[PDB]
Amino acid sequence: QVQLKESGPGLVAPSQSLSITCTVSGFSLTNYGVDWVRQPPGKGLEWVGVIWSGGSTNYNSALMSRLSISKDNSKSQVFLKMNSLQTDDTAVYYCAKHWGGYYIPYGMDHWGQGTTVTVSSAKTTPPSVYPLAPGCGDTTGSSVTLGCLVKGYFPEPVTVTWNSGSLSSSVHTFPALLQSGLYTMSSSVTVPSSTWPSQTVTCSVAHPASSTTVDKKLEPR
Amino acid sequence: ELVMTQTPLSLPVSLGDQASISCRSSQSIVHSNGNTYLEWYLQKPGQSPKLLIYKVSNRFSGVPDRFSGSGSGTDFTLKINRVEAEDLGVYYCFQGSHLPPTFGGGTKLEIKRADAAPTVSIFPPSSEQLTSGGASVVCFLNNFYPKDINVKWKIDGSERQNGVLNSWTDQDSKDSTYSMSSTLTLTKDEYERHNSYTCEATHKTSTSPIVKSFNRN
Numbered sequence: 001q002v003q004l005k006e007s008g009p010g011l012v013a014p015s016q017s018l019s020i021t022c023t024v025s026g027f028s029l030t031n032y033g034v035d036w037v038r039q040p041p042g043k044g045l046e047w048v049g050v051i052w053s054g055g056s057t058n059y060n061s062a063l064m065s066r067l068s069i070s071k072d073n074s075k076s077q078v079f080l081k082m083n084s085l086q087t088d089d090t091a092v093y094y095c096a097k098h099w100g101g102y103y104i105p106y107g108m109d110h111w112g113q114g115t116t117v118t119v120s121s122a123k124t125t126p127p128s129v130y131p132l133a134p135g136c137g138d139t140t141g142s143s144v145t146l147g148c149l150v151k152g153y154f155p156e157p158v159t160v161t162w163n164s165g166s167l168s169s170s171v172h173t174f175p176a177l178l179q180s181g182l183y184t185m186s187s188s189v190t191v192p193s194s195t196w197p198s199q200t201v202t203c204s205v206a207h208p209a210s211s212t213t214v215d216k217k218l219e220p221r
Numbered sequence: 222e223l224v225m226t227q228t229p230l231s232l233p234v235s236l237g238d239q240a241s242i243s244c245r246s247s248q249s250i251v252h253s254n255g256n257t258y259l260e261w262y263l264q265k266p267g268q269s270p271k272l273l274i275y276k277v278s279n280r281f282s283g284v285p286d287r288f289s290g291s292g293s294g295t296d297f298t299l300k301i302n303r304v305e306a307e308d309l310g311v312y313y314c315f316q317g318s319h320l321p322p323t324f325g326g327g328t329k330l331e332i333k334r335a336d337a338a339p340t341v342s343i344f345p346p347s348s349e350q351l352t353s354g355g356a357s358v359v360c361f362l363n364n365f366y367p368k369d370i371n372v373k374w375k376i377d378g379s380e381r382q383n384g385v386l387n388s389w390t391d392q393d394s395k396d397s398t399y400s401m402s403s404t405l406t407l408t409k410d411e412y413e414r415h416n417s418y419t420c421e422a423t424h425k426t427s428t429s430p431i432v433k434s435f436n437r438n
């Protein structure tokens with residue numbers, strides 16, 4: 001079974017260095033070449049570079065003077081170094097193997113899961129969570145939409161869980177946006193209106209990065 | 222320095238119909254060895270890219286024959302027949318022959334469905350936020366189609382543009398609709414000096430806007 005697995009720092013300051021290791025499983029680095037590809041938030045894929053099974057490298061035109069790609073064959077690991085980081089370098093970084101084991105790849109075979117790299121000068125900040133509850137002035141019927149507003153955190157991401165997962169029943173997760181240097185997202189859940197406020201509804205907000213879990217009971221008024 | 226340009230950017234297609242994606246290179250891609258190295262990748266929402274077609278026209282293992290690629294020297298097409306729900310995502314042409322390898326800009330495959338009006342709900346600021354100094358009024362527009370939609374924020378019947386943030390979901394895989402969230406952020410002091418807050422959603426399902434509001438009282 002062929003596997004690729006990237007480990008990265010997560011967050012890095014905007015002039016420091018980035019170093020990502022991709023460990024390889026199920027095939028040897030003396031047989032195949034390895035591509036690094038990146039994707040900035042909401043943008044298309046960019047080819048970053050390649051290290052060939054030989055040991056030689058090629059870099060993307062735009063990034064070629066900041067990039068170095070090395071490799072330890074014995075350890076099954078591939079390294080990407082990147083100097084003088086820009087805010088632009090914020091991306092998910094993937095490694096991929098060539099399916100052609102010879103100097104002309106037919107394509108990129110298997111891919112890693114990718115690793116998020118965030119480049120800034122903001123600091124780990126737990127999120128503020130605020131409940132989103134109907135005004136006592138507009139009673140609907142069949143069903144009720146409730147929300148949680150998750151504001152002022154860093155870095156990405158959070159996960160909002162509703163009632164221990166008991167509700168995937170129309171959860172909508174709105175992608176985070178950047179606000180005053182920090183992220184904000186919101187999540188909504190729709191439930192039968194005979195079960196709220198009758199029965200308890202909670203949103204649980206995990207922010208692994210700061211090690212915080214925040215719960216908010218959703219209550220009328 | 223070898224630019225691949227994909228069209229269209231976003232391709233609406235009915236479930237079971239045929240989808241057709243094209244890629245053009247700024248320069249002919251053919252190696253004087255007759256060979257031509259063009260591959261098509263698919264990236265499903267939240268997933269790693271995966272190889273569909275590898276030498277203009279070759280299917281990668283496990284890829285159903287309803288996916289086909291063709292093209293000459295600068296002109297290439299991916300064709301998807303009988304489009305299923307699994308087919309949704311962004312398609313990328315890729316060229317590796319010529320150094321450096323380069324992707325096209327991607328084409329989002331969107332599932333066409335019947336128009337659907339949003340369910341809108343406005344939410345006043347929580348008191349715990351008010352305590353903090355801020356006040357965000359929130360509007361959810363859930364489960365609509367198509368994606369274009371206009372949110373207009375009103376404060377005592379006056380339009381407000383400053384401090385609005387909007388966020389769309391990707392297309393739902395089950396019902397094929399979009400949802401979006403609009404947030405108006407004011408200071409507590411700003412917020413407390415007005416009575417009404419109004420969310421207005423204009424959407425092709427109606428010439429009438431859908432309006433939700435509350436009074437602070």
Ligand SMILES: [Zn+2]
Pocket residue numbers: 033034035049050098105317322
């Ligand atoms: Zn390569």
Ligand SMILES: [Zn+2]
Pocket residue numbers: 002109110
């Ligand atoms: Zn394989």
Ligand SMILES: [Zn+2]
Pocket residue numbers: 252253254
């Ligand atoms: Zn050649």
Ligand SMILES: [Zn+2]
Pocket residue numbers: 286
């Ligand atoms: Zn067949």
Ligand SMILES: [Zn+2]
Pocket residue numbers: 319320
């Ligand atoms: Zn060339």
Ligand SMILES: [Zn+2]
Pocket residue numbers: 170172363364393398400
């Ligand atoms: Zn939905």
Ligand SMILES: [Zn+2]
Pocket residue numbers: 376377414415416
């Ligand atoms: Zn006023």
